[PDB]
Design a protein around this ligand. Sequence first.
Ligand SMILES: Nc1nc2ccc(NC(=O)CCCC(=O)O)cc2[nH]1
Ligand SMILES: Nc1nc2ccc(NC(=O)CCCC(=O)O)cc2[nH]1
Lengths: 216, 216, 216, 214
Amino acid sequence: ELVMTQTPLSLPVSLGDQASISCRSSQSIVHSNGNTYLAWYLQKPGQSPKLLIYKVSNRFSGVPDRFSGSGSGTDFTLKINRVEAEDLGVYYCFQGSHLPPTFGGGTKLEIKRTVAAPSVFIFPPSDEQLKSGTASVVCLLNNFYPREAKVQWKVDNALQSGNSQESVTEQDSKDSTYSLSSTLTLSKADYEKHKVYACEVTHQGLSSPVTKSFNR
Amino acid sequence: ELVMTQTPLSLPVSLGDQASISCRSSQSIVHSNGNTYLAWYLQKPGQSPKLLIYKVSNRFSGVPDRFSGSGSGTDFTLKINRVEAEDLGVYYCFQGSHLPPTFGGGTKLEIKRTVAAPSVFIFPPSDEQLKSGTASVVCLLNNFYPREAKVQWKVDNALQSGNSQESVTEQDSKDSTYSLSSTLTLSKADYEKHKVYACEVTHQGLSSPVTKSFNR
Amino acid sequence: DVQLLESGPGLVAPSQSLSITCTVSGFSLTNYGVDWVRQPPGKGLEWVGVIWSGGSTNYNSALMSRLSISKDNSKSQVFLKMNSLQTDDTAVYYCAKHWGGYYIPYGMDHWGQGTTVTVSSASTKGPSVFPLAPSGGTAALGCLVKDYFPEPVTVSWNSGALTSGVHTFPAVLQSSGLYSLSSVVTVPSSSLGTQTYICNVNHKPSNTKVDKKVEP
Amino acid sequence: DVQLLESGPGLVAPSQSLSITCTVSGFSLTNYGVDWVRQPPGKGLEWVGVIWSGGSTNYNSALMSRLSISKDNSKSQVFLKMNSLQTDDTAVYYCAKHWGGYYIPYGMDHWGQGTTVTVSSASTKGPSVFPLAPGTAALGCLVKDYFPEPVTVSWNSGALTSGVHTFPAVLQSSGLYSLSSVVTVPSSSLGTQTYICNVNHKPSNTKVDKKVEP
Ligand SMILES: Nc1nc2ccc(NC(=O)CCCC(=O)O)cc2[nH]1
Ligand SMILES: Nc1nc2ccc(NC(=O)CCCC(=O)O)cc2[nH]1
């Protein structure tokens, strides 16, 4: 059985720069009929995979000329010229010359754009939820770059720990930014034992750490 | 970051033949100080990994000379001469020249020996279990080769399906055989409705299917 | 116009069997092969198997003892079955149509949406949905979708009418073994008084449909 | 003489933290580096990180934002901690001592037995143990309905080693595990010789010694 090896696993590229991805096979994927059945697929966030390239170097209908496939035998390469926001996602190579066919591990294209500070918002538990016996406080960090962001919860000015979870979105296809939500969860009892709930946010696009808060 | 590619995934070898395992690095693992930090580990069934080779080709104390490492730059090979029963398990390469160090995926060494038929045994549910409401019926196939075996349950000559589960041991380090259990789980009420319980076995080493059974 | 859609049961117990149907439109299964591909959470795409136009199949090495693919050309359906489900088998399962070539496809041109299979002994649960009640000329509002199992939920706004400004976060598994996420949307502050915002949450595995008005 | 032993909590709930202690003997942590390596069920070995003799550390790319390795040289102890655990993190976690070389080890020469971590919201459950009743005779124990892994099985306190086969456990639709352990013995022994399987399930702190009679 063949092994398809793709590097790098993750590939930070600046808008408008070129991207080069490697895909190697453990043996020749040249068929005895003389063709080499190697395809490249792109899977964008929240999408199913799409066919970019077939037979080493042939563009699938509707695939821009910025994308090109080359190589022979065991060593193949995808090149993307003038990378754009929309090119983001995980690329895979796929060998179909020999049974069983296999995908490579994938290479994740991450876009490097200019710094963007988050817009920060905080939300108190809804009344409904409180009357169900639990309090979710949410902090939202909208459309920022880079992904690295620090979020600290403070309850009556005491820094919290172990009582919250974060979710970050996939990088955005239109402007190459992230959004993050940290949710702080508490029993109603604990929630009502306190007054000021604040979310303190550190990010490279902010001048000092920004805090958003409310009094319960 | 480096990728270590090991092939094959699985390597069936005959007792006394040679085994050859490949380990490929996506970039050179020659350090700037001039050493190449590539080691090989064997992990035997139910054991922790053990170091065989370090710095490409140096045997660890106590490792027999049937084992040797060779190679350079990106392409490395472990050769095992005169494979023995005890050499069974999963071999892994390991690159230490570059941060972060990485294991390959592993190559599983399967030993190929002469045909051996299973000794078949059947066990009724214990009384203790019956008095709890469930009836487990166990069929055991002991010390056979090859691994492919067919176990069928029949209840009053009625072929069963989807009410039983198999477990197979790892290959044996002294005799290169497998053992296998098949458990037929039944509610107490469904058990007591029937009389004859039978496990029927088909194997390469058996000249016709062997049935073992009991009356409840 | 070419379509492929997966139909699955969402939640299967360990040891039990998975049955997925691909329903196909705009081409004939008599003239095209279909592949089955899968993707474990956070992990790479895996080729599972294929069913050729004439009805023959081929399978993945790792799964082929538990897999079987069949079809009904007359009904434009293709079936994947798989027994003895493991935790490992939790994945998004895609069917993809073959395109190009003679006896080996040049690629997979059209894919279904994927259907999500979680392998687990836990029981289905529909979400509780709470409002997130509402920057400079801009307002964030959203919905907290809490305590549901298994994935996915679908979230929309104003029955799909409101598309721009939406961020539906990846789910996070809580210590309770239940999932939670939040969908947010940025709106004009000048609209809050005249426009109503209802978030539409759909959890198919539990057959639950919840519409929550998010008021100031 | 060199020994490494991992001590873990067996079952951690999703989103929560792991803390495993490696206790070491026969060498000084002031002189050697130790690695952490892990193995998801059925899967390959993954290097997790290291803590060098001097106290610096390095980490796995995939885990490094949730990982921290520290140690107490005087107590011969190394700690691994990891936060925000996912199902993914279910694995056997080994510590291994560094051997050879100057600033880069030639290899890892001694390893601990490994400790098993299941990331799950379910609760601990001990096994029910039932006999499998017997010139060669098979007898065994059925060890059923336990969560999480592992269980250990021995016969006659470990006196009886030969002809033993303890089977890989299977997960049942109930979300509980089950295995059997069997032993082949002389039929002439069945009247004179006693046969007890000793089952130990450390997550539920349960221990069952069952006597298997004809
Ligand atoms: N989307 C795809 N599904 C498949 C399935 C199988 C493919 N290749 C082969 O079967 C190779 C056959 C080699 C031979 O000619 O014997 C290729 C392929 N591509
Ligand atoms: N068992 C092992 N654990 C480790 C950890 C790190 C290893 N290699 C390096 O740190 C290379 C550093 C390269 C340099 O900076 O000189 C090598 C290694 N082997």
